[PDB]
């Protein structure tokens, strides 16, 4: 089947890409890489980083990611990423790196590492937004350059398209976990009280920026059409609508949150990660060896 | 003991650094790394590179490097180098890299890899010339920066065609230097190629090569060669050069057609891979990588 690779460092992300990944793990060969080596391109607190790595893994498992169907692993645990990244750093031009839209050198040399993350597994598709367009283009250029000289040409395509969830405080802005205003987003780990507060915070009619965003969250999470909801809330106010949407969000997160705690306090977590690295290390190790063979490294 | 690390990409070379290498491996923990990963920072022909890697290893063994005393290995065969190099790339500043006096990103990001080569083995000494001074300074700065935040702080044959330059395989004239693998015919031609007395820039250089290769003093060669021409000197020196490389070349060719070579290299990587592995793991632990 086709290979999918996702490098990971809210409800809008869940809905936007993650929630469909749980169906797609059965059709496609999915790879979920916790890019801890990319994380260190900026200041990091060792304890926090280590903790965030575990949380992310648990969250992905809690959401439905099947460790037997997909490959969930930690980047640093697969040396091939660093090995391949160096080889690619030798074929990439400084100009290409400098041109990047986005002083620690990791901030400039990380693109070749991202290309290695992808190219290492002969991935066909990469579920990324427009913010990663340039990055994907560079990895495609590097793949072509290497191929012609001595990989599958990756493609940036999120396979099952969801809604674009916007911030609760700025309806024209995409909802992001890096928002200065915590009120702008809803975390997969937020508690009932927080969800309500965040959801509760001049037309007065429920028709499809602010209201429309709420409807998208409601629709995708409830399974009801935007028209269905429009009819159901006819002549109704935002209060009840918000009180309603707040309950659906909670009902969605609660099962996820409790699975997250089991994983977080279970030994299976580390066991599952050990297997992921093994599965990944196996595919990547082979690729690195072919790369070295083509370049002339070692024996 | 103290740890020594030497990353490797003429007779002047042997006499310079490598001869004494044949000696210090017994009272020092020496590491001889064939930096093939650094080699790819510039265009390379896969077949040539692969071949050059083998040759270099054989040459180092043929010269006297004891695989049981020192650690001879190929850089790429130890993933820790690339792993540690990335972590160091994250603590180094672009400005520091740009400031380097020495185009793939690799020409600019290779210094952090060289620092990893060194720091990985807690080396105390690095046998390098002034051309690597800046590089050594950067690895010392990186070691200090990492330590404070979260390593060991590490620290003449002229040309034949130009007695004022220096003898160097990088010469466009192959007749300005002598290769350890050069044959008798070549050695003679290169050695044979107005004041007309012998004592001690061309003559002083010849006397130096003669002295260090023969074992006799420069004065010994001076009283020895009282009232002689350059003909007979050049013929004598050229013989000593052949007598020096002969045994070496014989050992070299032996290694180049034996399976013990790959056996020795496998062992080097495994002794190197074990130690570098431990360091990488401590680095990751300090930075918060993985688990
Ligand atoms: N608010 C959102 N709505 C829809 N998709 C989102 C949202 N936030 C993130 N994503 C998707 O989830 C991933 C976010 O990756 P990142 O660039 O680190 O934010 C990409 O696949 C995005 O397209
Ligand atoms: N005459 C010499 N004396 C001492 N070391 C030498 C001599 N010739 C070559 N070398 C060594 O060989 C290395 C080659 O440097 P490079 O020009 O970059 O290839 C130098 O860094 C020295 O360590
Ligand atoms: N650069 C991505 C993460 C990432 C690293 N390597 C990747 C490979 C494929 C997709 C994404 C990635 C981000 O910051 O979000
Ligand atoms: N940079 C050195 C080779 C090298 C790589 N790593 C090293 C570590 C120590 C000493 C030398 C090296 C050269 O070009 O000659």
From Swiss-Prot, chain A:
GO terms for molecular function: ATP binding; tryptophan-tRNA ligase activity. Keywords: Aminoacyl-tRNA synthetase, ATP-binding, Cytoplasm, Ligase, Nucleotide-binding, Protein biosynthesis. Its EC number is 6.1.1.2. It holds the Pfam family tRNA-synt_1b. It catalyses: tRNA(Trp) + L-tryptophan + ATP = L-tryptophyl-tRNA(Trp) + AMP + diphosphate + H(+). GO terms for biological process: tryptophanyl-tRNA aminoacylation. Gene3D superfamilies: HUPs, Tyrosyl-Transfer RNA Synthetase. PANTHER family: TRYPTOPHAN--TRNA LIGASE, MITOCHONDRIAL (PTHR43766:SF1). It is found in: Cytoplasm. Transmembrane segments: none annotated. Its main location: cytoplasm. Inhibited by indolmycin, a competitive inhibitor for tryptophan. Homodimer. Belongs to the class-I aminoacyl-tRNA synthetase family. It is an enzyme of class 6 (ligase). CDD domains: TrpRS_core. One of its GO terms (cellular component) is cytosol. A motif ('KMSKS' region) lies at residues 174-178. Catalyzes the attachment of tryptophan to tRNA(Trp). L-tryptophan binds at residue 117. The keyword Nucleotide-binding applies. This is Tryptophan--tRNA ligase. ATP binds at residues 12-13, 129-131, 165, 174-178.
């Amino acid at each position: 089947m086709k290979t999918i690779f996702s490098g990971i460092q809210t409800i809008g992300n869940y809905i936007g890409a993650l929630r469909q990944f749980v169906e797609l793990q059965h059709e496609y060969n999915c790879y979920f890489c916790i890019v801890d080596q990319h994380a260190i391109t900026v200041w990091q607190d060792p304890h926090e980083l280590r903790q965030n790595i575990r949380r992310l893994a648990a969250l992905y498992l809690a959401v439905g990611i099947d460790p037997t169907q997909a490959t969930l692993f930690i980047q640093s645990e697969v040396p091939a990423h660093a090995q391949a990244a160096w080889m690619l750093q030798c074929i990439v031009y400084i100009g290409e790196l400098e041109r990047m839209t986005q002083v620690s050198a990791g901030l400039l040399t990380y693109p070749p590492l991202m290309a290695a993350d992808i190219l290492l597994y002969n991935t066909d598709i990469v579920p990324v937004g427009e913010d990663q367009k340039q990055h994907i283009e560079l990895t495609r250029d590097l793949a072509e350059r290497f191929n012609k000289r001595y990989f599958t040409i990756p493609e940036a395509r999120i396979p099952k398209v969801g809604a674009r969830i916007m911030s609760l405080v700025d309806p024209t802005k995409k909802m992001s976990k890096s928002d200065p205003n915590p009120k702008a987003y809803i975390t997969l780990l937020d508690d009932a009280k927080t969800i309500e507060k965040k959801i509760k915070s001049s037309e007065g009619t429920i028709r499809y920026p602010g209201i429309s965003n709420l409807l998208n969250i409601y629709s995708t999470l409830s399974g009801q059409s935007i028209e269905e909801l429009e009819r159901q809330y006819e002549g109704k106010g935002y209060g009840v609508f918000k009180a309603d949407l707040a309950q659906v969000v909670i009902e969605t997160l609660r099962p996820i949150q409790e699975r997250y705690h089991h994983w977080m306090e279970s030994e299976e977590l580390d066991r599952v990660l050990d297997e992921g690295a093994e599965k990944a290390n196996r595919v990547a190790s082979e690729m690195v060896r072919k790369m070295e063979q083509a370049m002339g490294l070692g024996r």
